[model samples]
Target: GAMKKKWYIVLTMSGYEEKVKENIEKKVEATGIKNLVGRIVIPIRGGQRRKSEKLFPGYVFVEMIMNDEAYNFVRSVPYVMGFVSSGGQPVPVKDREMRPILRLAGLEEYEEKKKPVKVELGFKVGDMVKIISGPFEDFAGVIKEIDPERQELKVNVTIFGRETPVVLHVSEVEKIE
Candidate 1:
């Protein structure tokens, strides 16, 4: 039976993520297992207008057919910690989890038909949240309004002892729980 390729997370030594990926690429080529292994990626974000950052530090995403040979080969690479595994066995990442990562890597096509809905509004009006980004970073505020469509929040923060209104993307704040 033919094996199907799946995405697996490989943990690596701190500050060696890029070297770990390069090592795997070189090894795969030398070992002539290019067909067994697929793309190796270090997930990153914010490359435009800002310095790119590793989304998952100390980790690399590898696509491969997880047979014993392939598994042993990757595990032997220097600076590799191990696969994100359970009970000493490598586990494949779920499709749902990989979808966003793949999209971020531009390795997968976006599906319009599967448009996401705001199923859970984690915050509500009057909720206290901490602004985590923008000029208001580290400021605590009360949620004045929530735009479900835009996933934004209208927050009222105190600045210079005066109430100030600030609009921020949902990602820019977190519930002050």
Candidate 2:
């Protein structure tokens, strides 16, 4: 038997992952390197109730039997930024690293969550915080209310004349003392 095929991480331009995958498949077919290349995947998640999102943007996983020709063929694909390498050659992705990504993307067998989610708010009402993202960047405010489902915080900011209520994502604010 020959060497076993292993997974490799290939970086791609943002928004070009799918295109790169398609190009790789076409090349594998046209060049008769089907024996070397096995499968290519871009991890993503979106279903009936969830919004579309890439698990790892700008990354594609490839299963291939590594060789000079195979390496050259994959690198030649459009939008391929090249493999994640340590020195001379690309490093193979280990099973430990691949499993969680595959599970989160729904490519691997994982128990789906069916119960209601419980969230504890990091910043509470009257907590002072500094906005770190969006148009309100660097502005200090007091958290007026929190919406756990939306992950939003209603903050009161002092404007020119009156206190302005600014809505921001929970990640966009840092709790201040």
Candidate 3:
């Protein structure tokens, strides 16, 4: 009898996740090890009305039969990073853990609002903030850090072939503007 079982594992890749997946698929297919492996998925996450980019941009997920050979093949591909782990060990996920997300991103709504979104008045986490309202208007920089209390910021900017530093008031920075 077939086991109607599903297991999910995380895969970290050398920022070449697509190529790594191809390598694994080609190897398993060329060797006719289809049963040893099953599905390799790069989850195409749907975005909110607001943009939701990759959680782990250069990573993928694998669904396969649990066996020694399958596990080994996942780890052996070039640019393969390895399974995601907790406490430095691989953790397995059940479809029960993953199914809800498939629906929320695929049309069924998740009842809870994630968190309060604010039109934050300063540079944000991971923002390539650009200035568009001051003497330095139209200048762009990678935010190094922010001081929400002081409403001040430091940015790593490129000018004259070097990464120059710039500081700004909250209003002095415009995200993507």
Candidate 4:
């Protein structure tokens, strides 16, 4: 049988991510299922002074050979909610998306010290959006400036009756629904 290994998102309860990973690894090792279960990552910024933040709170990434048995073992681990899914099936992270994440987590080596951040294209300058992630979640703002190469947008968010420009990543905000 061919090994179909890839990165899949694991949903874990907040404040228990590292604990869950620890338990999962121990279980895999104790059961001798290391061949099916693989690396469990909690992403950390890969620069000097290394900042490790929950890239996505309540979510962890696991590289594994997907199968019902593998899924069952992982889900049975403490604090694991389930795999992040779409249409009732576990979804694998796209290779492009997984690359940046792996590099950020220090799991992959990249030759360049800094690569140009890829800006997600569906947004335009002056479009109103709601910050969906990060500390600024739920704030409403208008796009004022865009630095696509930097993958960030300068948004004018109203604060104290004044429009204050705030910088955020393109992935940090979503178009107002």
What tens digits encode model 1's per-residue C-alpha lDDT throughout 48-162? Answer: 5442366556767888887777778878888888888767747877766565466556666543433222223468888887776553355688888888877778888764235
Write candidate 2's Cα lDDT for 44-141 as tens digits: 54333543365456767878888887777777777888887878557777676566445544567654333333323457898887776643455788
Better of 1 and 2 by TM-score: 1
Candidate 4 lDDT over residue span 108-164, tens digit each: 765632323333656788988766554345578898888866677878876324566
Lowest lDDT 10-residue stretch of candidate 2: 111-120
The best-first sequence of candidates by lDDT reads: 1, 4, 2, 3
Query: Candidate 3, residues 50-122: lDDT per residue as tens digits?
Result: 3224434555666667666666765676676677666542555554434433442352444433332232544
Q: In model 1, which runs have C-alpha deviations exceeding 4 angstroms?
A: 45-47, 50-52, 109-177
lDDT of 4 at 141: 88
> Model 4 — which ten-residue stretch has the worst lDDT?
110-119
- The segments of candidate 3 whose C-alpha lies over 4 angstroms from its true place after superposition are 1-5, 47-51, 86-89, 104-177
Candidate 2 residues lying further than 4 Å off, grouped into runs, are 46-48, 112-177
lDDT of 3 at 105: 38
The TM-score, computed over Cα atoms with residue i paired to residue i, of candidate 3 is 0.47
Candidate 3 vs candidate 4, TM-score winner:
4
